[PDB]
Every structure is written in structure tokens, then in C-alpha cells.
Amino acid sequence: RIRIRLKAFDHRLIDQATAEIVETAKRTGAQVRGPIPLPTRKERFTVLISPHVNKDARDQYEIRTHLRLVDIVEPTEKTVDALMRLDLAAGVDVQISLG
Amino acid sequence: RQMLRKATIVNAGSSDFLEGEQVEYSRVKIANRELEANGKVGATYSRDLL
Amino acid sequence: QSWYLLYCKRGQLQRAQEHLERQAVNCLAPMITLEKIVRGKRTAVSEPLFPNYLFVEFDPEVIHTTTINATRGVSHFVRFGASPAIVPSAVIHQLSVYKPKDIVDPATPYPGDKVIITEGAFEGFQAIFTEPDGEARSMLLLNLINKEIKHSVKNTEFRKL
Amino acid sequence: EEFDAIKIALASPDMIRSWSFGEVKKPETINYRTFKPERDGLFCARIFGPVKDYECLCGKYKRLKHRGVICEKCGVEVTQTKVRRERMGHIELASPTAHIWFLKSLPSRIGLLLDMPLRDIERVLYFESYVVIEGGMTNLERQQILTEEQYLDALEEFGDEFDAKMGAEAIQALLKSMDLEQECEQLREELNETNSETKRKKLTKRIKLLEAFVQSGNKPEWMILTVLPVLPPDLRPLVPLDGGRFATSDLNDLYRRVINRNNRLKRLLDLAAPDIIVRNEKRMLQEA
Amino acid sequence: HARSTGSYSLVTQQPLGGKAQFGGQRFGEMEVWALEAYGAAYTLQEMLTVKSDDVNGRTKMYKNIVDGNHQMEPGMPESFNVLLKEIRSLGINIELED
Amino acid sequence: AKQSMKAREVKRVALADKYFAKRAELKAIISDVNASDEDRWNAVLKLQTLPRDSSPSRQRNRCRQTGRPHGFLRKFGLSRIKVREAAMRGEIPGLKKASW
DNA sequence: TCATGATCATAGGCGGTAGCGTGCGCCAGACAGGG
DNA sequence: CCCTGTCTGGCGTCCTCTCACCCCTATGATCATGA
């Protein structure tokens, strides 16, 4: 079975990408597992914002990496093959893995 | 007029022609017209009919 | 009545060479084996390497050519000139046994070849036989944003579907 | 656009490579399952462009706000089909090849460039003689044409530093080893000193050719084709006769014959030619 | 027979020939000589660039005629570009200077 | 930082790149308990011979823009100051001010 | 179940154990023959 | 080298209209029927 791991910083974008892959799957094959949301990675960073010295002066950024697990239970001939020509929107790292 | 348009050189002179070259007539006439107008010696010709 | 290289025709030696090897006539051509999956089937044929180039022993004058024309073995002599050129037999004399170049089976694949892996829909991309393991089936040598899987394909298919 | 002159000259093989967008390698034209052409034969898509406008062969780009990006599957730059009227391709000939317009136009430019009559050049270019290049300190001249027995003599007695070749490689070495400055000075000195009217007329024609060849920017070895262009595919169209078949134009037949013969010559130079054998195939390619 | 604007040939972008094919009459070579023999210069320019061959020129012409502006944007005959490709497909290097 | 410092570092990086295999092999030899004493000694002396800039522990991480040694961050390869500028200007993807 | 025969579909450049060509004409310029 | 014959390249009106013609033959493979 094909596990698919979508990763992105924008959550709307990743959602769009999840949808689109699901459609790609459903037309060709059958029994798409589903778009399961895994936990988001909130990597935080603190930095001093002064050029020279003001230590309590700080800014706290973060990057929210969003995960979407989509799974395909029955890999057919047509379905797996669709994805090659079906590239997704940019800023979305996908990761397919059969078995 | 459009028949006898070429010409052949006899003395190349101070220009850049040959002794048996067959160059067109108006070219050699403006060439020795601009050679002879100053203190030089031009290039003389002879006509052939085509 | 000697060795002469002629541009000839193919595959049916033994009849024009019945005319010939009816005598002690001599014949030769470069050599090669061919493993070629013709139509879903690996076939092995050690056939002559060359096209119509072929060494034949015969004698020119008394036996005139137009009589013998009606057969194969006839494109024309090695010439480099108007006259039928007396050819050397370098292989026969000083180069008997060869073809260690390879058995490349000219342009037909061995394991690990880089060519088309899928047709129909998914093809528009030279995916790769990381191994023609057996001409049967797998899941492609495809590469997107995950692991590079190898062939997705059935017997007659992984190559030119 | 705007222009005031049409310049004509010979074309270097780098110029033919710089016109060309790809290389034709196979002689197939259409698939005749569909009419999607075969990669990369005469009618191509990744050499010459897409058949349909902004219609990528694989199909992945068709947006008004998505123009400029090329395809990845078939690698066809989603543009216009007018570009199949202007893109050219090139064929890499496996062995060099004499152009016919400079060999048999009466007068022969290769003829009265080399100071060599046309019959010797035809007997060298069709692989049925031997001409000498780099004769060395032997009995033999430079422009001396030979035969089979004389080459046997010259390779028995002088199998060392003596050299001689045949075919278009030999003519290319003759034309490349031609020094034009020495020929200009020698012909001017001879027409100063010889003064015989047959020699006068012949040598002044040859020095007219040499001054018109030195003053321009040509080279003598460009008259032997190494790389051969192909015409763009809209200008050699493949008409249907509405009967399931294509009565093809004559050009695709000619290019198909050259590519068949060239691929067979590449394969015969690959798997080694039988000594005095890699010659008939080059004669066939020259004649095609 | 009469033709305003019909189909166009494929290899050289000129109108087709005949009546069954909806075609235009051949403005032959001696008619070109007969218009050189007058002083008609714009008539010959549109007679062999706008009306016949240049595709962007004739679409500009059709828009300009249906809008009332009698004016031609000349351009180049496309069949001259075909001549450049056929001479260039030999070993000959023809160009366009400046 | 200065140009010279940046150059020194680049050099050091180059050297680390160069001598990685050998230095690692030597470290392995020295570690290997199942090995001859003299061999181990040779290895440690050989390590001494190699250049000092060959060590990875010599190279300091700087800002890839300014070369500032302190205030560095690994994910971005930038010093805090330039990183902040990047967040503000939009050029770091995904990064935005965080509150919770 | 196996073998043989018949029918249908798909695939390339004188056709042959040679010879086919044969009813334009002028000019012109180079290539070569004779002396 | 100076003629003088041979050879092979060039060229031979414009515009339009109509019509036909534009692989068949051979070999190989598959299926069906009969023994």
C-alpha cells in the first residue's frame, strides 16, 4: 500500500495538495484510505533584535511544518502511474512510499 | 546600353585591378574618376559586348 | 577461382553457396551473437556480424555473371574503382578468430540499461530498468518525491510497451 | 525586420551546429498508431517543437498565467507551432562527405582550387583510387594519384613515414593543408615569369578564385560536409491522400535514405570494418 | 469565381489554386512586369506582401479594412523565409545583414 | 567580520573537505583497541603531522552574508540580525512572528 | 490432444540466375585528341 | 602548345478548366478441424 507524506509550511496549500492527490487517486483506482492529519512541527526561534546590546529585546519566530498522511490501499496499473505526470503545487514536499 | 555593360582593364595603374580582369564599367569609371580628380594617375579601360 | 569479398544478400547462404560449395568454395563474414527479445522472448542467434559483406570463392571469365545473377549473394564486388577489386582475406590469412569487442547485441539491452520503461499513459519520461530482472513485472523505476521504485510493468512491456 | 543586404557565404560546421536545436538520429517519421511522431526521427517534437499550439505532447501546461516554463515529461517547450517552421536539426555524418555543388558544377571549384583535374577528384571521392597526402622524402609527389598496385608498392617499400589516403577524408586533408599565402605568391611570381597564353589564362582564373577566396572569410575545408542540415518539418509536409496512407514527399525519402545509410555506417565503424572493407559503405553514403 | 479571403496553403503561406478549392487568381510574373512598367509601387507591394503571403500583415489588413483605416503594415513574405530555409539547408549560409 | 577572516574560514573548510578520509581513518586506528601499540603511536604522530586547519573543530560557523561569528543559527546559516531582516522582508519561507 | 492446413494480416524499393534505353535541338564552354 | 573535335551542361509561353491515379504479393502466425 502506498503511504504518501505531504509536508508544507502553508496549511491551506498543503490542504489543496491533499485534495488534489486524493482526486488523482480516486478516479483511477479505488478505496483511497484518507487524508489523515499528523501533528504539526512548530519549530521556534528566539533572537536578539538589537544590533549591539539589549538582551530583553527579542523576537520569537516559528515555522509550522504541516504533515498530511494520505494512503492508497490498492495500487493499480493506472493509478500509481498517474502521479508521475501529476506534479503538485510548489512549496509542498510530497513523499510517496509503497509498502 | 544594358548589353555592353562590362569592361576589361588594360593598365591597372594606381588602382587595385588586374591586367585581364573584367569589371563592370560604371565601377571603373567612378574609380578612375576619384583617382584622376586628385593628383594621381587613373585606370584606363576597354569595353566588351555581352 | 579465389576468395573475394562481395556485397551480397542475407540469410540464404546455402543456395548460392550450393552453386559455390558444390565446389571447394570459400565463404566468410564477421560474426556476432544476438540476444534479442524479439516479441516477449529472448532469442539467441550467433549470426554473421556484417550486412551483405561476404567472402566467396569463384572464377570470373568462363562462368559469366549474368547467368548466375538470378540468385542472392549479389549486390556487387568490392571495387574502390571500376574493376572488381581483388580483395585481401586478412581474416583468413592473419586474423582467423575474433569478435572480442563485445556481444553488445547492437543497441538491444543488457541489465541496467537506461531507456524507456513505460508507455500508454505513464511514459513521457525515461524511467529506468535499474535491472531487467525478468521481463515480467514490478512497480516502475519511477522517481517523484519519495523512494525510487523499479519497473511497473509486465512481460512485453518494460522496454517499449 | 529592417535590413539593407543579403549576404551569402559558405557555412562552417559550427554554424550548422548553432542553427540546429537537436540531432536527428532515426529515420522514422510517424507512429501510424496515432500520428504522434517518433522520437527523435525526422518529424520530431523535442527537436522541432509541439504539433499543437501551447499543446505540450505530454500535456501539463495550459494556463494564461503559466507561459515560458518548458515540459518535463516530453521536455517540449509549450510555445507555438509556427516554431516548427523555423527550427532546424542537424545530422552528424559518420565520415565526411563532398558537397556536389563544388565538385560538379563545371567549372569545379575544388577542381581549380587544388590545381587538379576533375577526373582524379572523382576517382578519389568515390573510393576507387588513392591520392597522396604528406608524401615525405620519397619518390612520390603531393598531388600524385595512385592505384591499387602502386599503393602496394608504396606500402611495401615505404610502409613507414609515407602516407596517402582516399575518399573525402583525403580531400579534406588536401584542402586543410592548403596554404593560401604561398599559392598567391607563387601564382603571382609565375604569371610574372612564365608568360604563356594558355598558362596565362588558366593561372589568372585560378588567382581570381584565390584572391576572391582570401579576401573573404571562408576556409577551403568547409566545402566538405561534416554536419548536414535538415529542413524544418513544415517545409517538407507529409500530405494525407485520405486513404489511410501517406504518399510522402520526395525530401523525406531522401533524408530517410541518408539516415539509414549513416546509421549502418556508424554500426559498421563500431564493430570494426574488415580491413579493406570500410569503403563501400562510405561510397554509398556519399552517393546518397 | 471570386475570393475575398479563403484557405491558405501549408508549405508556402499563399492562397490555394483552382475553383473547387476556393482559390485566388495567379498574379503571375508578366503582371508583375506590367506593374513595374507603370509607376505603381504600392499596388505591387500589397499585391505580393499583404494580399498574398505575410500572415501577420494580412490579419492587420483585415482588422484595418473592417475598421475603415486603409493602411498596410508590410512585413516580409513568408515564402522568402522558405527560400532562406531551402538555401540554408544546403551548405550555403545566407543571412540578412545589418 | 573582515574579508580576511572569511577567507581564512573558507580555507579551513577546504582543508576539512580535503583530509576527511585520512583523518577519520587515523582516528579509527587510534581508537581501535584490537591493534598494535606501535601502530597506535604511529597513528597519533601522523595525526600531528597533518595540518591543523584540517580539523573540523577548528572552523567557526559564521553568517553567510556578514561573516559575524556570534549570534549564529544553523537552520538559516545567518546571524540573528540578518535572520530577523529576512523574516521581516518575507524571504525566509514559513517563518513568522510567533505568539502563544 | 496434437498436427496440419487454410485464411488473414502485416510488412519494403530494376527483377533477375539479363536487359531494359532508340522520334529534339541549339549554344557554349571546358576537356581533351591530333599534330 | 595550338588548334579542333567531343562532351555534357544549360535552356525551350502564360493563365485557366476537367479527369484518373497514389502498392499488391509473400510470408508468418493463429485458429479450427480432423484423426
Swiss-Prot record, chain D:
Co-administration of salinamide and rifampicin or salinamide and myxopyronin suppresses the emergence of resistance to both antibiotics. Signal peptide: none annotated. Coiled coil: none annotated. This is DNA-directed RNA polymerase subunit beta'. Belongs to the RNA polymerase beta' chain family. Acetylated on several lysine residues in the presence of glucose. Zn(2+) 1 binds at C56, C58, C71, C74. The chain holds residues 15 to 302 of 1407 of the full protein. DNA-dependent RNA polymerase (RNAP) catalyzes the transcription of DNA into RNA using the four ribonucleoside triphosphates as substrates. Resistance to the antibiotics salinamide A, salinamide B, rifampicin, streptolydigin, CBR703, myxopyronin, and lipiarmycin can result from mutations in this protein. The RNAP catalytic core consists of 2 alpha, 1 beta, 1 beta' and 1 omega subunit. When a sigma factor is associated with the core the holoenzyme is formed, which can initiate transcription. The rRNA transcription and antitermination complex (rrnTAC) consists of RNAP, NusA, NusB, NusE (rpsJ), NusG, SubB, ribosomal protein S4, DNA and precursor rRNA; S4 is more flexible than other subunits.
Curated annotation (Swiss-Prot), chain E:
Acetylated on several lysine residues in the presence of glucose. Co-administration of salinamide and rifampicin or salinamide and myxopyronin suppresses the emergence of resistance to both antibiotics. It comes from the Bacteria. The RNAP catalytic core consists of 2 alpha, 1 beta, 1 beta' and 1 omega subunit. When a sigma factor is associated with the core the holoenzyme is formed, which can initiate transcription. The rRNA transcription and antitermination complex (rrnTAC) consists of RNAP, NusA, NusB, NusE (rpsJ), NusG, SubB, ribosomal protein S4, DNA and precursor rRNA; S4 is more flexible than other subunits. In pull-down experiments interacts with CedA. (Microbial infection) Interacts (via flap domain) with Escherichia phage lambda antitermination protein Q; this interaction renders bacterial RNAP resistant to transcription pausing and allows it to read through termination signals. Belongs to the RNA polymerase beta chain family. DNA-dependent RNA polymerase (RNAP) catalyzes the transcription of DNA into RNA using the four ribonucleoside triphosphates as substrates. Resistance to the antibiotics salinamide A, salinamide B, rifampicin, streptolydigin, CBR703, myxopyronin, and lipiarmycin can result from mutations in this protein. This is DNA-directed RNA polymerase subunit beta. The lineage of its organism: Bacteria, Pseudomonadati, Pseudomonadota, Gammaproteobacteria, Enterobacterales. The gene is rpoB. The chain holds residues 1244 to 1341 of 1342 of the full protein.
